[PDB]
């Protein structure tokens, strides 16, 4: 599956923050949507999710135009979103968070929903907190429950927003292992992040957007040896 995105555009206060941002993503592949802060990497990311309405552009997913659909109508097509901020259901237990979205899945029955919930808890090692409220778990443990909850909806493309946000260097490997696990599960991952040192370490194909347009494209090795990216975003030393 391919999430073709063509000629995105959006203006704010009569100023075009995003001008002709176009990139392509495939299932089972990590793609990093990077760039200078405020240059349109966040806004172009949100127009893929659906939070920000698209002024101009075309977002197809395997000959399925997802341009006119809202946030939820795209999510039913197989697009996932993991907010940077804490988005766990505070008053629902960790097992109820995953079970809340599993009941939304129409591809299962009560018998296999409990089996799917059990293995999702075991996959992310949150079984020991399956009965604790979502508001009373560690930030590292909660984020694993948010990803497990997102995987309960069976997404084809998981768009991660700032995954390495407030993550210590000891636990940056844990996030990379999670993101690598999503790729091995057949889910394409779109990462937008301010921490470009580690986002350029897991992504297979990165898009640098500056001044509202994509200024470079390719593997992280090609991104580093790009004169425009080095001059504008990464700097002479990196």
């Amino acid at each position: 599956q391919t999430l073709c995105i063509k000629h995105l555009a959006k203006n704010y206060s009569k100023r075009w923050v995003v001008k002709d941002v176009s990139f392509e993503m495939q299932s089972g592949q990590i793609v990093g949507l990077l760039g200078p802060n405020g240059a349109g990497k966040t806004t172009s990311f949100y127009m893929v999710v659906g939070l920000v309405r698209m002024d101009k552009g075309e977002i197809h997913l395997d000959n399925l135009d997802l341009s006119d659909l809202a946030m939820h109508e795209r999510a039913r097509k197989g697009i996932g979103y993991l907010p940077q901020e804490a988005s766990i259901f505070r008053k629902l237990t960790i097992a109820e968070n995953i079970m809340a979205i599993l009941e939304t899945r129409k591809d299962l029955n009560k018998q296999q929903r409990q089996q799917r919930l059990q293995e999702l808890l075991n996959d992310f090692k949150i079984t020991h907190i399956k009965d604790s409220l979502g508001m009373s778990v560690s930030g590292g443990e909660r984020r694993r429950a948010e990803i497990a909850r997102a995987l309960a909806a069976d997404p084809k493309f998981m768009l991660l927003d700032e995954p390495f946000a407030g993550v210590d260097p000891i636990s940056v490997g844990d996030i990379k292992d999670i993101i690598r696990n999503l790729k091995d599960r057949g889910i394409g991952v779109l990462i937008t992040d301010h921490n470009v040192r580690e986002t350029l370490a897991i992504c297979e194909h990165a898009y640098i957007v500056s001044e509202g347009a994509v200024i470079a494209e390719g593997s992280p090795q090609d991104i580093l040896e790009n004169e425009q990216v080095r001059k504008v975003y990464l700097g002479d030393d990196f």
């Binding site: 999710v49 659906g50 939070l51 309405r53 809202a70 946030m71 939820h72 109508e73 999510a75 039913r76 996932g80 979103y81 993991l82 907010p83 901020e85 804490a86 988005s87 259901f89 505070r90 008053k91 629902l92 109820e96 079970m99 809340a100 979205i101 009941e103 939304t104 948010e146 909850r149 997102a150 309960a152 909806a153």
Partner: protein
């Protein structure tokens, strides 16, 4: 889906009921300060306490507005409404879950209006303390000096004159005698429709009873519509705002709606068009405007 539905409904229901408890307690305390003017004080606390169901009945439309603002505001500010859309739960489904919470308040509004308010109102009047000079039945004008629910100096005039009959002790019925002094607004729907049907069978129903009838039949629809406006504001203008700002705005919509429904109620008694236009005016427009803010997502 049931676990998500219970979480959205219970969170909003506790916010609608929590605001209801607070708003009634504040209005009982504020009203108690006022009556104290015309003072015994205890005789004045029971009169205000007995009026609590009637203060409760008039708070339900504004407690449901603030309840949906605070109930969904807690969900919105915690980024919980974003992850319901991220899995395939529409905006109109989340609104439908909040309406389920408001439907408890609508049923509570019916119970107070039909069986609770008309009783505690009568008990309140006694604490503070049978129609006299009652004045048309088609072509006949009837004046009775004293009328009892169980007559004195009757006077009936027939119409060109035929007979002016007088007695010392006709379509008048004792059942509706006790409803004559009661304001049309205060009458319960069971009492109002029965009284209007009685007047319409023998005379013309005044426009102050038509307005009271329309202000009651459109009371459940103003509670649901005002909830939908609250939900659309959370997904629209009041998204990412503080909890205090949402509460402040929820108070401006509540007063704006109470003033608009008060003013357009009065305007229906001075202008030719039927009170249905003035009562169902804002309700239809807020539903259309509220449903548009939901279409903008």
């Amino acid at each position: 889906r049931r676990i998500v539905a219970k979480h959205v409904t219970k969170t909003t229901a506790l916010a609608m009921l929590g605001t209801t408890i607070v708003l009634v307690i504040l209005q009982v305390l504020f009203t108690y300060l006022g009556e104290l003017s015309n003072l015994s004080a205890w005789q004045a606390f029971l009169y205000v306490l007995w009026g609590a169901p009637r203060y409760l009945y008039e708070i339900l439309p504004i407690s449901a507005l603030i309840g949906a603002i605070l109930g969904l505001g807690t969900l919105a500010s915690n980024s919980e409404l974003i992850v319901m859309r991220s899995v395939g739960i529409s905006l109109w489904r989340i609104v439908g879950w909040v309406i389920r919470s408001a439907l408890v308040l609508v049923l509570l509004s019916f119970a107070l209006s039909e069986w609770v308010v008309p009783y505690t109102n009568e008990r309140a009047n006694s604490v503070k303390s049978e129609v006299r000079g009652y004045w048309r039945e088609g072509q006949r004008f009837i004046y009775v000096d004293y009328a009892n629910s169980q007559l004195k100096r009757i006077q009936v005039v027939d119409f060109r004159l035929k007979s002016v009959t007088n007695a010392e002790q006709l379509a008048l019925q004792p059942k509706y005698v006790h409803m004559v002094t009661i304001d049309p607004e205060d009458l319960s729907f069971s009492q109002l429709v029965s009284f209007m049907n009685y007047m319409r069978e023998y005379s013309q129903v005044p426009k102050t009873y038509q307005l009271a009838f329309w202000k009651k039949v459109a009371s459940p629809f103003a509670l649901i519509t005002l909830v939908l406006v609250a939900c659309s504001f959370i997904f629209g203008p009041l998204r990412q705002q503080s909890m205090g700002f949402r509460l402040v705005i929820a108070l401006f919509i509540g007063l704006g709606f109470y003033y608009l429904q008060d003013f357009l109620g009065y305007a229906s008694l001075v202008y030719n068009p039927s009170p249905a236009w003035f009562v169902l005016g804002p309700i239809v427009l807020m539903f259309v405007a509220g449903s548009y803010l939901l279409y903008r997502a």
